[PDB]
Amino acid sequence: PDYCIPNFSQTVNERTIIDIFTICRYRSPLVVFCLSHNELAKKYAQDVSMSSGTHVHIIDGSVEITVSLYRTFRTIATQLLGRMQIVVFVTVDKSVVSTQVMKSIAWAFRGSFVELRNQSVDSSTLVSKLENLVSFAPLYNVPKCGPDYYGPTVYSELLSLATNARTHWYATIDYSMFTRSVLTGFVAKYFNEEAVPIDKRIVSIVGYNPPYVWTCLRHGIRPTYIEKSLPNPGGKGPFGLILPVINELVLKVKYVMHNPQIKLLCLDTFMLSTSMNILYIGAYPATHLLSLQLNGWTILAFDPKITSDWTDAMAKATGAKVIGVSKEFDFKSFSVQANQLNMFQNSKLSVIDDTWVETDYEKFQSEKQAYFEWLIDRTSIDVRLISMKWNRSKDTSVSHLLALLPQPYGASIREMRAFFHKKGASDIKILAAETEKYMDDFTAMSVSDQINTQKFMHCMITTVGDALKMDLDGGRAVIASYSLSNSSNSKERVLKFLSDANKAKAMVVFGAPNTHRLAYAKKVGLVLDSAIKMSKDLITFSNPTGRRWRDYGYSQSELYDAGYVEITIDQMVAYSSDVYNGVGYFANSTYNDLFSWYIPKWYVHKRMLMQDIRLSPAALVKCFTTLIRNICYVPHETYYRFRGILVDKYLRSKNVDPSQYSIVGSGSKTFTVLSHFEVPHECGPLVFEASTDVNISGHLLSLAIAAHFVASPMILWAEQMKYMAVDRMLPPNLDKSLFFDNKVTPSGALQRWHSREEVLLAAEICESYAAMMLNNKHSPDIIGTLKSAINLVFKI
Amino acid sequence: DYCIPNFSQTVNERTIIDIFTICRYRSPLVVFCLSHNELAKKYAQDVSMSSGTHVHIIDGSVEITVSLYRTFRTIATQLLGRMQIVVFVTVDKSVVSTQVMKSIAWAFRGSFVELRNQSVDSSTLVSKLENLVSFAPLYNVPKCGPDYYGPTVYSELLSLATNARTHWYATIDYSMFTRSVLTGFVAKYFNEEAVPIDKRIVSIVGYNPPYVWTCLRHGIRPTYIEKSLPNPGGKGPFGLILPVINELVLKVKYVMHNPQIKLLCLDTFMLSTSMNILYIGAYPATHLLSLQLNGWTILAFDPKITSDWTDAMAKATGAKVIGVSKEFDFKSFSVQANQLNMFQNSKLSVIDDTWVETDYEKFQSEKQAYFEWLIDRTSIDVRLISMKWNRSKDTSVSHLLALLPQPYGASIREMRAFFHKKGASDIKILAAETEKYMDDFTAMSVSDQINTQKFMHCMITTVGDALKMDLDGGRAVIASYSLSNSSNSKERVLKFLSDANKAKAMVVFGAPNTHRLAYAKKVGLVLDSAIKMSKDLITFSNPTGRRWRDYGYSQSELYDAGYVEITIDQMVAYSSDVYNGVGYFANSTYNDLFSWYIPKWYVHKRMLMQDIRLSPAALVKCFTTLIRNICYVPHETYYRFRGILVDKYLRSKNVDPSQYSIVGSGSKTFTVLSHFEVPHECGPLVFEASTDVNISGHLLSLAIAAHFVASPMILWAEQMKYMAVDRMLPPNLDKSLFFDNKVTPSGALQRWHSREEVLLAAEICESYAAMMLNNKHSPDIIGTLKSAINLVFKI
Ligand SMILES: Nc1nc2c(ncn2[C@@H]2O[C@H](COP(=O)(O)O)[C@@H](O)[C@H]2O)c(=O)[nH]1
Ligand SMILES: Nc1nc2c(ncn2[C@@H]2O[C@H](COP(=O)(O)O)[C@@H](O)[C@H]2O)c(=O)[nH]1
């Protein structure tokens, strides 16, 4: 035993399990770089491999593209835990493989994607981004699974002596930002695929979570928050939002956001959430809007600096109906028919006012105030909210004033924002002495304390109510995790709520800590009791800052019995690749991997049974097995011999007579049947006809290992495996290259994968397979919940 | 911290443990030579798609020098990635020879396959190509050697009858590889020094059985030296007639798989006693084909000997063989008969392997009379005669030195009688006592039987203290535990080694490395229940339960005595063209605790010019890359970190920061603005203004590698000092061997670093190791290397 190979007894201990968890933080080493100049590709490929050992591939066109993709990415799928950079240069034209297809492939393998096939050989962009490969390897400054990034990691700082060649790195926070972004993008993809009308692209966020305002507007979605109780902001007015009171954050380390013109994005993404029609006064330039998707929005912009080119550019970039007007806004006409407001009749309207003067400012504002006080009251228009900049040294009385707030990304600015609303205060006297004293307290707070005051404006798009009783009709979109997962929320009452949402054809995306993965991480000693405790399903969390909170853990089998399928964040962004406008990430996160995300069973069966590369588990089914085989001296053919030996032991334990089968143990045949026999199973008996070949599913086995360390696509894969029990046709509306990893019959159809017996047999040896691979340091709980979920998928 | 690069949260003691573990996998390379490029491309695809093996093809579309340079710079960074690497060479033998590609492969600890003149459908070619896909990430060709004869049988990995398992004794197998490589290095020395064949002898200090086989695989004859010999307890003068036994420890069943091991065990011993052999009954003796016996003469008697057999035996072994197709005449009794005239006034030994089914015990008596006669010649110096012994009745025997059992004979009841002149004059061997002696022998385990070869090998063993031996003539000696153990003090050992380097002898010395062993204990890899240490006094223990004392040595102590550390990897690659030993499959933590050393005089004579066989290329980058990946160190950031360390050091020595501008790139560490000096043990380091300084990166990387495995640092330092100026390429050697060195326009090898750029790197070396290993480095290891480099750059 100790002196034999393959060897699991000396090589796989609790320490090796720890190291595998650690290696999982590095499971995204891929960069996909598209350019149109092959000699330039060969030069930097050799440069980055000679200097840092980056594995490089070039898809040059000397081989057909489908074959080129299949060979390259079947190789790469096994190296993803090798802790070394991988770079695929793509030099074929866009007519051979399109930008959107290559982006789907790259993101399905957790890679960064760079598209530069239109640039000539000596572009500044092209040479610079190619030289970055050599400078940064094994790192790269293009995010994985997303073109954009705005966190504190600044890659140029790694090359500067002034910074000591260092930069910030908040893997957990950044991956949490990437997750909120992807969940939003998946809802965006769901809205397009279900042809949901534009003015109904609304998503309910259960529990307040500020970044969803920006992510939703980046995708043309309006967010609504749902909260159990209403925290009294402590200010004046009917909702307490006139000079609200503050309570401070805890000592930490600071996470800084580097969005350009962040102060304008914060107010404008919020206002755009309130109405599909916007009156924007002072809009020039509004370059910050160019990065949003505003399909269905109508913006009536007023600024003397508006040109005809500005209106055309803004509409082209955002997709919104923009109507630029190069006149100063006339605040002293009190008519609807003036200022072109006629278009907004019998519809809702919100107003954003960014106008300011250097002459007669303080009474210029009361002209605007008197006009906005008049404007909020029309019955031919449903004016929802008016944003105005406020700075007064003289006391004023204001009507319909709902809120008077500081600016979260305002720093030392003495300027405030006033919000007008129908349900606001009938009258209130704003004494300029207390706003000055208020702005002195605000400007003396830490930037972190200032940014958290955005909860005051965001509560103007918040609803009070129990999320477990909301209306689910209309395919309503809901994203829900902590605030739903546990507020002492009964696990029964949550599971029933999710069960009803699936039956109502609703889109409630749900996330929760994975009970059995967390347990396994604690047992092997990766997560310590001082950081995370657990008693059955109840979890007590803590982050390194000192905050603690309770949460309920769920498992894949509990949610499948409630009509919910686990899908990974990787699969979600790849599936949504042609709609995603979010951020990417640079590092994976152990803490984020403890959580699993789920989607309703009805939407899986409707849209997801035909697995192309976007929903492939290829980035998980090969790299864990390959890593273990390298540590444990498991030759390639020896691995397949082991699968036969485990089948032989299993069949003997079910009192099958060995004379009825012949163990082969190959890559194509597990065993041959001699006499017909049957094996008891909960999904009905497994029937093996005599003189047949049986080849059990390796995807199931290797995903069982993978489910110990990261979120598993096991249940989504199982549903696609059942679908692929017979030959299928390739969908005609999808690009053929998305199927390079789907094997094809001689007639050009999609070949069947496995029979039902071949799948469920793998489920039965699955426990002993993990016990073998992990030296009995596996988790029977994780195997059992998966096993129990495979059985429900194949239920008879 | 919340910053990258990050060493504080990524490198703790557990991370150090893993690096030590990963070192067991530091030989993932296979170099496969074949002439068919589309076949290489087909299997390069099959092995990478199925197992993730990284594949390279040297296909001749690019000039060979830069193809090697590009491919092996890439590979050198990946040797610790725990993934197999395969390089296919499809260019012709005239573009890069077999012996040059073998040196390259072994210099990178790879296995080597040469099949370049085989058809695209050759049985062996397609078989060994399919073995790549079937065995990956393993391969069945040994690393750093063509042959393997241990218990690991790769075919069992594919057999369901075996449960797809096989034996795996990494520590013993690597110790066998080490013995073999040391022997080969002594053989390469014998070639370079033009040592006459009849004087190719090596003295193994301390009895060490496998050296008999490794020496005869290289045309060398072994001699053991023991301080004292326990008398075997038997009869005759030297007590070798039926010696008594004391048996071994319960445990590991390591069974060597040599074909006809019974004959190799005797024949390699008999071949150690004389260059001229009389082989009676020599057919077929296929076991001899594996040996290198150039300078031997074998006269072989067997009625089945053909002239083809005499040809294939001489072509394989290189020996001069006379093939007599006739029965030996044991009654002739003449020095001028049986063609024996050719041995007059020569040394001779006799291997007798004859038998008969009828007339046997009479046939033995006829043989015995001829041998008792033949041992007494004055015309020829008959040194030893071995005969099959199986007698049913008492006999008187003359000149009988030994009557031994067959160590690999298992249950066979026949024995071996050895005739020598210094043997018993008359002695009666009662057949009733041998019968019961063979009763006890055949009842022992196979390991107890095999160990009786000590009785044979004490006939090529001298008694005496090894520190008093004569070192004249460039004598070759292999010495390890039986020198460095606590019965002799270090001072008396170091003086012996110092007097041997002064005397221009080739004493190859090995010892455990004090600081590497202490570092493996401090971080928690080696526990006190296995190895304990009191300063430099080490108490070992292996899983069988045996315990022993030994003394640790350091690189500085031995450079003080005129000895240079050289790794096993460098020895086998330096000796590649003569090497005929075994390879290995896995590296061993236990063996990595040891260091081997050669005399400084020979380093200076033959090893200052660094071609790929002597380079540290397979160690100067794989640790740095592994750490850069763990700790998020970008490529250019790694070079700015280097300049920042020089900044912190120069300011610590009260250099004014205005005198230099830190650049921190791969080409320039910093630029000098004003002339300044920094004090140093070897004389001040002089930096003049308007100069670019680029310190030695290899020294920094090697200091890291010296924490985990043996270091070529001191050999590298001697080659570095020799490279302060340009040096002319040797016109002897193939120029592909220098693919990794920069060659000047003129055709000579370009200077590497000035004296200032080396010693500056050695001074920031401690802080570099503190940075890379999160202050969990070994100051002892840094200091012993720093003091050895200082001694190398002495003025
Ligand atoms: N594209 C794709 N093919 C699969 C998947 N699962 C199985 N297959 C196909 O079915 C074959 C047999 O499945 P396996 O034995 O690997 O579970 C695979 O080699 C592959 O061709 C999958 O999840 N995605
Ligand atoms: N071939 C070879 N070149 C070396 C070695 N050490 C330094 N160099 C040369 O020295 C220069 C870089 O110095 P380093 O920073 O690598 O010590 C390069 O020109 C490199 O080729 C060595 O051990 N072998």
Contact B585, B709 (CB under 8 A): no
Task: Please tell me the distance from the alpha carbon of residue A80 to that of residue A60, in angstroms, as a whole number.
Answer: 23
Residues of chain A numbered 19-48 and touching chain B (CB < 8 Å): 19, 26, 46
* CA neighbor of A25 nearest in space, from A708, A594, A591, A588: A588
DSSP per-residue codes, A219-240: TT-EEEEEESS------BSTTS
Answer whether B462 touches A (CB < 8 Å): no
Which ranges constitute the DSSP H helices of B286-349?
307-317
Contact B640, B664 (CB under 8 A): yes
Helix (H, G, I), strand (E, B) or coil at A48: helix
DSSP per-residue codes, A596-615: EEEEEHHHHHHHTSS--GGG
Helix (H, G, I), strand (E, B) or coil at B320: strand
Task: Please tell me the distance from the alpha carbon of residue A190 to that of residue A273, in angstroms, as a whole number.
Answer: 19
Tell me the chain B residues in contact with residue A46 when contact means C-beta distances shorter than 8 Å.
70
Please indicate whether residue A753, judged by its CB atom, sits closer than 6 Å to ligand 1. Answer: yes
**Other beta carbons within 10 Å of A680:** 9
Helix (H, G, I), strand (E, B) or coil at A694: strand
Tell me whether strands B506-512 and B532-534 are parallel, antiparallel or unpaired: unpaired
CB nearest A159 (choices: B83, B134, B637): B637
User: What is the best residue among B752, B758, B792 to mutate for testing ligand 2's pocket, by most ligand atoms within 8 Å of CB?
Assistant: B752
- Binary contact (A638, B77; C-beta < 8 A): no
* Per-residue DSSP letter, A425: B
In terms of C-beta density within 10 A (0-12 exposed, 13-18 middle, 19 or more buried), how is residue B466 classed? buried
| Number of inter-chain CB pairs under 8 A, A vs B | 158
Tell me the chain A residues in contact with residue B6 when contact means C-beta distances shorter than 8 Å.
169
Contact B43, B120 (CB under 8 A): no
* Closest approach atom of ligand 1 to CA A743: 21
Please indicate whether residue A571, judged by its CB atom, sits closer than 6 Å to ligand 1. Answer: no
Task: Please tell me the distance from the alpha carbon of residue A305 to that of residue B341, in angstroms, as a whole number.
Answer: 119
Residues 6+ apart with CB under 8 A from A440: none
* Per-residue DSSP letter, B352: E
Tell me the chain B residues in contact with residue A83 when contact means C-beta distances shorter than 8 Å.
81, 629-630
Task: Please tell me the distance from the alpha carbon of residue B402 to that of residue B461, in angstroms, as a whole number.
Answer: 15
DSSP per-residue codes, B514-578: HHHHHHHHHTTSS-TTT-EEETTEEEEE-TT--EEEEE-B-HHHHHHTTEEE--HHHHHHHTTTT
Q: In what helix (H) or strand (E) does residue A788 lie, and over which residues does it extend?
A: helix A780-793
* Closest approach atom of ligand 1 to CA A700: 17
* CA neighbor of A626 nearest in space, from A23, A45, A140, A10: A23
Answer whether A172 touches B (CB < 8 Å): no
Contact A477, A507 (CB under 8 A): yes
Distance (Å) from the alpha carbon of A151 to chain B's nearest alpha carbon: 13
CA of B641 to the centre of ligand 2 (A): 19
Contact B174, B587 (CB under 8 A): yes
Method: X-ray
**Other beta carbons within 10 Å of A489:** 17
Contact A726, A697 (CB under 8 A): no
Helix (H, G, I), strand (E, B) or coil at B66: helix
CB nearest A644 (choices: B135, B160, B635): B160
B172's tokens: 């013993």
- Binary contact (A138, B78; C-beta < 8 A): no
Amino acid at B611: D
Amino acid at B607: M
**Other beta carbons within 10 Å of B491:** 8
Answer whether A666 touches B (CB < 8 Å): no
Nearest residue (by CA) to ligand 1, atom 21, is: A743
Residues 6+ apart with CB under 8 A from A490: none
Say if residue A138 is preceded by a cis peptide, omega within 30 of 0.
Answer: yes
Helix (H, G, I), strand (E, B) or coil at B189: helix
Residue A235: left (phi > 0), alpha (psi -120 to 50), or beta?
Answer: beta
Positive or negative: CA dihedral B501, B507, B508, B510: negative
B622's tokens: 């794989």
Positive or negative: CA dihedral A523, A525, A527, A529: positive
Helix (H, G, I), strand (E, B) or coil at A750: strand
Best B1, B3, B130, B633 residue to mutate vs chain A (most A CBs within 10 Å): B3
Answer whether A111 touches B (CB < 8 Å): no
Phi and psi, residue B534, nearest 5° = -120, 95
Answer whether B530 touches A (CB < 8 Å): no
Buried b / exposed e over A639-660, threshold 16 CB at 10 Å, is: bbbbbbbbbbebbeeeebeeee
Task: Please tell me the distance from the alpha carbon of residue B226 to that of residue B228, in angstroms, as a whole number.
Answer: 5
Catalogue the E-assigned strands of B380-502.
381-389, 395-397, 400-405, 415-419, 427-429, 461-463, 476-479
CA atoms within 13 A on the CB side of A102: 27
Contact B692, B668 (CB under 8 A): yes
CA of A753 to the centre of ligand 1 (A): 6
Please indicate whether residue A611, judged by its CB atom, sits closer than 6 Å to ligand 1. Answer: yes
Contact A77, A620 (CB under 8 A): no
Answer whether A161 touches B (CB < 8 Å): yes
Residues 6+ apart with CB under 8 A from B328: B280, B281, B301, B338, B354
Ligand nearest to the CA of B614: 2
Phi and psi, residue A599, nearest 5° = -130, 155
* Per-residue DSSP letter, A344: G
Helix axes A623-632 and A698-706, enclosed angle (nearest 10): 80
Contact A287, A265 (CB under 8 A): no
B627's tokens: 């750490």
Task: Please tell me the distance from the alpha carbon of residue B463 to that of residue B225, in angstroms, as a whole number.
Answer: 6
Helix axes B622-630 and B13-22, enclosed angle (nearest 10): 140
Task: Please tell me the distance from the alpha carbon of residue B736 to that of residue B103, in angstroms, as a whole number.
Answer: 10
Phi and psi, residue B677, nearest 5° = -125, 150
Answer whether B134 touches A (CB < 8 Å): yes
Contact B575, B187 (CB under 8 A): yes
* CA neighbor of A33 nearest in space, from A80, A79, A72, A74: A72
Amino acid at B299: L
* Per-residue DSSP letter, B407: T
Contact B191, B578 (CB under 8 A): yes
Contact A36, A94 (CB under 8 A): no
CB nearest A161 (choices: B25, B134, B640): B640
Please indicate whether residue B221, judged by its CB atom, sits closer than 6 Å to ligand 2. Answer: no
- Binary contact (B4, A169; C-beta < 8 A): yes
- Binary contact (B160, A635; C-beta < 8 A): no
Task: Please tell me the distance from the alpha carbon of residue B556 to that of residue B785, in angstroms, as a whole number.
Answer: 7
Helix (H, G, I), strand (E, B) or coil at A575: helix
Ligand nearest to the CA of B668: 2
Residues 6+ apart with CB under 8 A from A662: A671, A672, A674
Residue with tokens 């925290």: A231
Residue with tokens 């001040």: B684
Catalogue the E-assigned strands of A284-333.
298-302, 321-325
Q: How far is CA A293 from each of CA A286, A353, A580, A711, rounded to the nearest angstrom?
A: 14, 21, 10, 30
Answer whether B78 touches A (CB < 8 Å): yes
B38's tokens: 């589309």
Task: Please tell me the distance from the alpha carbon of residue A556 to that of residue A551, in angstroms, as a whole number.
Answer: 17
Q: In what helix (H) or strand (E) does residue A380 lie, and over which residues does it extend?
A: none
- Binary contact (B166, A5; C-beta < 8 A): yes
B502's tokens: 């002064």
Q: How far is CA B497 from each of CA A69, A677, A791, B484, B486, rounded to the nearest angstrom?
A: 61, 75, 73, 11, 16
Residue with tokens 């059990």: A696
User: What is the best residue among A699, A745, A769 to mutate for testing ligand 1's pocket, by most ligand atoms within 8 Å of CB?
Assistant: A699
Residues of chain B numbered 538-567 and touching chain A (CB < 8 Å): none
* Per-residue DSSP letter, A203: E
Nearest residue (by CA) to ligand 2, atom 19, is: B752
In terms of C-beta density within 10 A (0-12 exposed, 13-18 middle, 19 or more buried), how is residue B400 classed? buried
* CA neighbor of A471 nearest in space, from A202, A139, A287, A119: A202
- Binary contact (B632, A74; C-beta < 8 A): no
Helix axes A780-793 and A756-773, enclosed angle (nearest 10): 170
Task: Please tell me the distance from the alpha carbon of residue B738 to that of residue B749, in angstroms, as a whole number.
Answer: 9
Buried b / exposed e over B338-351, threshold 16 CB at 10 Å, is: bebeebeeeebbbb
Helix (H, G, I), strand (E, B) or coil at A509: strand
Residues 6+ apart with CB under 8 A from B667: B692, B694
B464 has which bridge partners? Answer: none
C-alpha B572 chain-centroid distance:
6
Answer whether B635 touches A (CB < 8 Å): yes
In terms of C-beta density within 10 A (0-12 exposed, 13-18 middle, 19 or more buried), how is residue A549 classed? exposed
Ligand nearest to the CA of B697: 2
DSSP per-residue codes, B257-272: --TTHHHHHHHHHHTT
Answer whether B150 touches A (CB < 8 Å): no
**Residues A702, A708, A713, A717, Cα dihedral to 10°:** 40
Positive or negative: CA dihedral B503, B507, B508, B509: negative
C-alpha B681 chain-centroid distance:
36
Say if residue B137 is preceded by a cis peptide, omega within 30 of 0.
Answer: yes
* CA neighbor of A156 nearest in space, from A139, A144, A175: A139
Task: Please tell me the distance from the alpha carbon of residue B584 to that of residue B595, in angstroms, as a whole number.
Answer: 18
**Other beta carbons within 10 Å of A788:** 17
Q: Which three-class secondary structure string do you get for A69-100?
A: HHHHHHHHCCCCCCCCCEEEEECCCCCCCCHH
Answer whether B255 touches A (CB < 8 Å): no
Sheet strands side by side (includes A86-90): A55-59, A86-90, A30-35, A112-116
Q: How far is CA B319 from each of CA A779, B266, B271, B277, B292, rounded to the nearest angstrom?
A: 64, 18, 12, 11, 8
- Binary contact (A642, B14; C-beta < 8 A): no
Please indicate whether residue B611, judged by its CB atom, sits closer than 6 Å to ligand 2. Answer: no
Q: In what helix (H) or strand (E) does residue B59 lie, and over which residues does it extend?
A: none
Q: How far is CA B54 from each of CA A78, A108, A632, B36, B63, rounded to the nearest angstrom?
A: 11, 22, 19, 19, 22
CA atoms within 13 A on the CB side of B396: 2
* Per-residue DSSP letter, B775: T
Tell me the chain B residues in contact with residue A645 when contact means C-beta distances shorter than 8 Å.
160, 163-164
CA atoms within 13 A on the CB side of B666: 9
Please indicate whether residue A709, judged by its CB atom, sits closer than 6 Å to ligand 1. Answer: no
Tell me whether strands A401-405 and A396-398 are parallel, antiparallel or unpaired: unpaired
A309's tokens: 């080119």
Helix (H, G, I), strand (E, B) or coil at B396: strand
A536's tokens: 């059955």
B448's tokens: 């107890």
